[PDB]
Design a protein around this nucleic acid. Structure first.
Length: 69
RNA sequence: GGGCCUGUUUACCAGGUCAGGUCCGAAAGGAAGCAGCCAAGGCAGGUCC
C-alpha cells in the first residue's frame, strides 16, 4: 500500500491536487517526504505545507491500518 | 574535448509547456505554476573531426 493505492481511494479534490504534485518515487516511498520536498508539494498544489502534512498524516493513518490489517 | 547517434540517469535550486490544484477578479478574464512530458544536464558507448 502506497501513495498510489491510497490515491485509488468536496475536499477529496485536494487530496489529489497534492499527490498529483509528487514524483513516482515519493508516491512509491513517502518516508522521504521532507521539508524541502514538502515545501515543493504545497506550492505545487497551491496548498499550505500544513495541508500536505495533514494529507501525509491521513495516508499515514491508513498505511498503519494496512500494516496491521 | 566538439558534432551526430544510442543506452541510462536527473524532486524544488531564474529553460518550455503545463493535467490536477491554487491565486487575484462581481464578471470578463489575469497571474504564478508542482507532477508529466519536452528540452537541458550527468554517466557511458558507437561514430566522425
Amino acid at each position: 500500500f502506497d501513495l498510489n493505492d491510497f490515491l485509488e481511494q468536496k475536499v477529496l479534490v485536494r487530496m489529489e491536487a497534492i499527490i498529483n504534485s509528487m514524483t513516482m518515487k515519493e508516491r512509491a516511498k513517502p518516508e522521504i517526504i521532507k521539508g524541502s520536498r514538502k515545501r515543493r508539494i504545497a506550492a505545487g498544489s497551491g496548498m499550505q505545507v500544513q495541508d500536505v502534512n495533514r494529507l501525509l498524516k491521513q495516508f499515514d493513518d491508513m498505511q498503519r491500518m494496512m500494516k496491521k490489517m
